[PDB]
Design a protein around this motif. Structure first.
Motif, short mmCIF file in Angstrom:
data_model
loop_
_atom_site.label_atom_id
_atom_site.label_comp_id
_atom_site.label_asym_id
_atom_site.label_seq_id
_atom_site.Cartn_x
_atom_site.Cartn_y
_atom_site.Cartn_z
N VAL A 14 -7.73 27.19 -29.94
CA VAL A 14 -8.58 26.23 -30.65
C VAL A 14 -9.34 25.38 -29.62
O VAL A 14 -8.82 25.08 -28.55
N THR A 15 -10.56 24.99 -29.95
CA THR A 15 -11.30 24.10 -29.06
C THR A 15 -11.17 22.64 -29.47
O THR A 15 -11.51 21.74 -28.70
N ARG A 16 -10.62 22.42 -30.67
CA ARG A 16 -10.44 21.09 -31.23
C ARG A 16 -9.10 21.07 -31.96
O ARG A 16 -8.74 22.03 -32.63
N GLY A 17 -8.35 19.99 -31.81
CA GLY A 17 -7.10 19.83 -32.54
C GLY A 17 -6.02 19.24 -31.65
O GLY A 17 -6.21 19.16 -30.44
N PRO A 18 -4.89 18.82 -32.26
CA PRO A 18 -3.84 18.10 -31.51
C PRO A 18 -3.31 18.83 -30.27
O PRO A 18 -2.98 18.16 -29.28
N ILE A 19 -3.23 20.16 -30.31
CA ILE A 19 -2.64 20.92 -29.20
C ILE A 19 -3.71 21.77 -28.53
O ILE A 19 -4.17 22.76 -29.10
N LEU A 20 -4.10 21.37 -27.31
CA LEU A 20 -5.13 22.10 -26.55
C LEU A 20 -4.49 22.77 -25.36
O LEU A 20 -3.50 22.29 -24.81
#
Ligand SMILES: *[C@@H]1O[C@](F)(CO)[C@@H](O)[C@H](O)[C@H]1O
Length: 1025
Positions: A89-95
């Motif tokens: 994911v490029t966005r969200g809590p876990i990068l």
């Protein structure tokens, strides 16, 4: 580039916990067999053979990644994508960037998980405290090394003669669905384990007539909804008759597919672990609920309407549930950006911790410009009410009342002192925000992401540039649905409708967030408000919360309230009080990835909006912030990870005992879901009297609402006010409007203010270490009665954060509650009164007191022994706002009676948000303090972890239980000196006239007060004989 993976989207409507049925097996794939697919870094790949449970000869292969996320914090992650390649994911809590940073650190330390495929193809690895084995069909067993306890195992289901299939990995055959799930064994019923399930953001659970903390044995969903009162009729289970109460099966405003399992509680063999299914489509958590045959008593699961599968098991480094919360916050951390302060969440201005009055229904700034109307109120009258009555009062939440015809980022003339709109900085025509600064106040205003579309040819720059730059969500879909049209255009835009009730309404376009360019445009709009004095942001209707709407109907017409229902289902025609779920939104999860329909990502939209407000609004345009360069966001919606943006309030509650109960529960739960800056409107937002909606909250309930709300991170009285031109709500709700109770209302707001440093220091603990501010009682270890008390006992404050115990009365007209005091520590009854009298005798921990007395004027609040609490006072003795305090308003370290001959304490210090230098350049101070008692000598020691902010005023030490000393010696880098007895004989005299190096013997409260110069704060040894 639309739908690049080529999904058939089979479900669009809401699907309740009654329609989610993994354990039914039929039409579902589960893990049947596998072979090794290599290991790189800490990521193993197993090539899994998924078998149709009901027809095992039907089989597919997908690669499944198993990743050790952290060795030291005992966490790993399982992910696959039944529908396409596995994607970060490029966005969200876990990068990935942060996962990469954690592994890089741990590798540099010699951490080796030792991930290996055995020769049988079994995958094994270790963490600091744990050893894991996954067998061929994905059967997983997680064992704790110290004692060999198996603390987690996933679920297998038997077949006739095809072998056991692992329901730890499940997806519906894409011929029939898009859903996913994962199932563990659940030891809720084990006589010894007694597994409990905690977390889940905002969910409310009723047991009999009382609202409770735990989330065990119930079926929950995450489906961000305009859920007014927490019981919207359209959220009812099929064929539901009679009143729908807020309860466990109803979605809320926050999306937290997250649970903390906790077993063998109160023993040395206790274990806890968090479980996060990172998914933003409609998601589910079932903790052993047989209702609707959704689950089985001995199975817990999580799942979601759409792919991909991405899940995390997070055990933490230490003993207790709090360690789970910190490790989770670690995984969503910002260490990879080298944040000097905002590591696990963003620090608010100090002013966020003050008491704020909102009102929906103000009609002017000033009385002199208030339009005539029944029960109309001006902003001015509200401020006068609080200030003339000496309330500690911080400022206002200004609602959509001030905008020009619901156009966000505008104001109308009535909300300026000259009754016309100006551009700011004019001393002969101040905006509400400018006038409020001159009252020593700060303000939040209401920002929604609806851009009014029906403007009658009148110009509205925001909508125009949204149109012109094509940044709005279009009306495209794969289903060929007609979302509607108006005469305003554009021919190709999604057009929604905002409805506040009472004719307060408009058409709206919306920002298509996943587009590059949108966020920059959005954040820049805030300049129009920051430049006229706005201090922070109150983010509303973030779902985005639209008017209920059935396809076919005119854009401004809602369906019958009873529709949809079981006998008359939506059938993909209900908008579900947001976007019609068929609409193609530019991908929020993956940049550069085209458009998916919004059903795939509904629970990320709010998170995305708050993100954009933060980065491009509060941060990039900080220049225009007038009085405080630091700002904050209070959102209504969001998704795990929101804390890097701001806090939350729990949307529209109401004015009953139950909603007090729910407010405590929410606050605790949301904290352990890593969103610590949260509260609920104090007094409830909505009308509660069914016979006459205008009846205001009673005095007793407000007292208790106030007593309960007073230490929770976010403390605001907000409400729907009945006015001629908006004829729904109550008459009034402000604390000053309660003559009989005022003296109790005022003192608890005072008490809060005095512990302003206790709250702000906990906020520091969260930003730096991820500790949650408010502790569930179960986070207190080695105690086997806290579980029972956890519904209405919560802890906070101090060096470790378990120094203050709260147990609010949660029923109107009650002067008793059963009280439990955590074991192996002593408690001191405290509260608003105890600042100006002596402490009473110590109460033993582990005492259960039935019918413990709590008059209306009291609340049960206890300070633990061995606490040293930083405490603030105004120099002049009047109540003022947090934001106009200076370092000449005394900072006092209150030392409570010692625990095992010691006491400890901590205090964070910065300029309070005046600038952003604490978080950009490290300009803060972290003072620690300690008291020890040896024979006849007591030593009080100040140290620092950094002292980059200079506390520019004198400070004090208040020793409780100490009277007259023979000598006090102060030793410090600079002033090594003996103290002398002040000629001051009162506290006000000691503050104003007392000299640095004076002590005062306070008999009236059995305290000894030491006055010390600012320069000895960072390092000092105080020896009292
Ligand atoms: C958003 O809608 C309002 F009711 C009006 O803007 C607010 O007062 C409310 O707190 C929030 O849910």
């Amino acid at each position: 580039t639309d739908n690049p993976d080529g999904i058939d989207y089979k479900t669009y409507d809401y699907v309740g916990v009654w329609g989610f049925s993994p354990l039914s097996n039929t039409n579902w794939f589960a893990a049947g067999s596998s072979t090794p697919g290599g290991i790189t870094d800490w990521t193993a790949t197993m090539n899994v053979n998924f078998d149709r449970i009901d027809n095992p000869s039907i089989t597919v292969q997908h690669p499944v990644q198993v990743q050790v996320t952290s060795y030291n914090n005992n966490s790993y992650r399982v992910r696959f994508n039944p529908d396409g390649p596995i994607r970060d994911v490029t966005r969200g809590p876990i990068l990935k960037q942060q996962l990469d940073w954690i592994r890089t650190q741990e590798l540099s330390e010699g951490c080796d998980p030792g991930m290996t495929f055995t020769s049988e193809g079994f995958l094994t690895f270790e963490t600091k405290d744990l050893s894991v084995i996954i067998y061929g069909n994905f059967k997983t067993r997680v064992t704790r090394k110290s004692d060999g306890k198996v603390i987690m195992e996933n679920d297998e289901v038997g077949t006739a003669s095809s072998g056991n299939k692992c329901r730890g990995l499940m997806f519906v055959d894409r011929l029939y669905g898009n859903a996913i799930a994962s199932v563990n064994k659940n030891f809720r019923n084990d006589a010894v384990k007694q597994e409990g399930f905690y977390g889940a953001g905002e969910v409310n659970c009723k047991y009999q007539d009382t609202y409770i903390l735990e989330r065990t044995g119930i079926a929950m969903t995450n489906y961000n909804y305009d859920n007014l009162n927490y019981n919207q009729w359209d959220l009812r289970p099929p064929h539901h008759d009679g009143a729908l109460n807020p309860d466990y099966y109803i979605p809320m405003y926050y999306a937290a597919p997250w649970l903390i399992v906790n077993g063998c509680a109160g023993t040395s063999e206790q274990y806890s672990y968090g479980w996060f299914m990172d998914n933003v489509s409609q998601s589910y958590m079932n903790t052993g609920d047989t209702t609707w045959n959704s689950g089985q008593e001995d199975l817990a699961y999580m799942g979601a309407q759409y792919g991909p599968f991405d899940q995390h098991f997070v055990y933490g480094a230490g003993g207790g549930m709090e360690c789970v919360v910190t490790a989770f916050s670690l995984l969503q951390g910002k260490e990879f950006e080298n944040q000097v302060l905002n590591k696990r969440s963003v620090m608010p201005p100090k002013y966020v911790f003050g008491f704020f009055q909102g009102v929906f229904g103000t009609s002017s700034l000033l009385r002199a410009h208030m339009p005539a109307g029944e029960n109309n109120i001006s902003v001015e009258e509200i401020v006068e009410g609080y200030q003339n009555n000496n309330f500690p009062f911080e400022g206002l939440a200004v609602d959509v009342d001030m905008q020009d015809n619901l156009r966000v980022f505008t104001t109308k003339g009535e909300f300026w002192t000259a009754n016309r709109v100006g551009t700011g900085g004019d001393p002969n025509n101040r905006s509400v925000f400018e006038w409020a600064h001159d009252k020593g106040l700060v303000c939040q205003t209401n920002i929604t992401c609806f851009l009014r579309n029906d403007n009658e040819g009148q110009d509205y720059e925001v909508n125009q540039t949204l149109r012109e730059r094509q940044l709005y969500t279009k009306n495209d879909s794969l289903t060929g649905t007609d979302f509607g049209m108006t005469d305003d255009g554009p021919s190709d835009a999604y057009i929604g409708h905002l409805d506040y009730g009472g004719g307060v309404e408009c058409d709206a376009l919306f920002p298509d967030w996943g587009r590059p360019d949108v966020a920059e445009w959005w954040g820049n709009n805030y300049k129009k408000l920051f430049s006229i004095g706005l201090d922070f942001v109150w983010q509303d209707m973030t779902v985005p919360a639209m008017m209920p709407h059935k396809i076919g109907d005119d854009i401004n017409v809602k369906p019958d309230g009873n529709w949809p229902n079981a006998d008359d289902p939506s059938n993909g025609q209900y908008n579900w009080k947001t976007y019609h779920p068929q609409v193609l939104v530019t991908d929020m999860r993956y940049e550069n990835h085209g458009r998916e329909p919004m059903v795939t990502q509904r629970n990320i939209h709010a998170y995305t909006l708050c993100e954009s407000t933060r980065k491009e609004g509060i941060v990039e345009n900080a220049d225009t912030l007038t009085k405080f360069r630091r700002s904050y966001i209070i959102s209504r919606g969001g998704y795990i990870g929101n804390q890097h943006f701001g806090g939350m309030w729990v949307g529209d509650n109401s004015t009953t005992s139950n909603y007090i109960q729910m407010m405590i529960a929410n606050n605790i739960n949301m904290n352990m879901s890593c969103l610590p800056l949260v509260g609920s409107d104090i007094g409830g937002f909505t009308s509660y009297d069914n016979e006459n909606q205008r009846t205001p909250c009673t005095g007793d309930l407000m007292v208790r609402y106030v007593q309960a709300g007073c230490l929770l991170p976010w403390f605001r009285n907000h409400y729907d006010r009945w006015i001629e031109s908006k004829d729904h709500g109550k008459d009034y709700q402000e604390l000053y409007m309660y003559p009989n109770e005022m003296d109790t209302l005022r003192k608890f707001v005072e008490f809060r203010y005095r512990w302003q440093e206790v709250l702000y220091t906990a906020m520091y603990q969260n930003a730096a270490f991820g500790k949650p501010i408010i502790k569930a009682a179960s986070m207190y270890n080695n105690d086997s009665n806290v579980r029972r008390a956890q519904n209405d006992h919560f802890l906070l404050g101090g060096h470790d954060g378990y120094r203050i115990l709260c147990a609010p009365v949660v029923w109107e007209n009650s002067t008793e509650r059963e009280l439990y005091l955590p074991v192996l520590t002593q408690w001191y009854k405290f509260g608003p009164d105890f600042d100006t009298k002596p402490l009473e005798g110590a109460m033993n921990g582990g005492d259960r007191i039935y019918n413990y007395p709590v008059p209306q004027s009291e609340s049960p609040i206890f300070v633990r022994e061995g606490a040293i609490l930083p405490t603030r006072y105004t120099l002049n003795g009047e109540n003022k706002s947090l934001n106009t305090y200076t370092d000449e308003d005394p900072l006092v370290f209150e030392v409570f009676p010692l625990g095992n001959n010691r006491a400890d304490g901590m205090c964070y210090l910065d300029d309070g948000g005046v600038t952003t230098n604490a978080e950009d350049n490290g300009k803060f101070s972290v003072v620690k303090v300690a008291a020890e008692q040896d024979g006849g000598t007591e030593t009080i020691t100040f140290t620092n972890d950094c002292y980059e902010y200079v506390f520019g005023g004198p400070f004090y030490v208040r020793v409780r239980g100490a009277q007259s000393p023979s000598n006090i010696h102060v030793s410090s880098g600079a002033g090594s000196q003996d103290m002398k007895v002040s000629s001051a004989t009162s506290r006000a005299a000691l503050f104003n006239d007392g000299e640095n190096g004076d002590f005062w013997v306070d008999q009236e409260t059995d305290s000894l007060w030491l006055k010390l110069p600012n320069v000895v704060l960072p390092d000092a040894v105080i020896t009292i004989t």
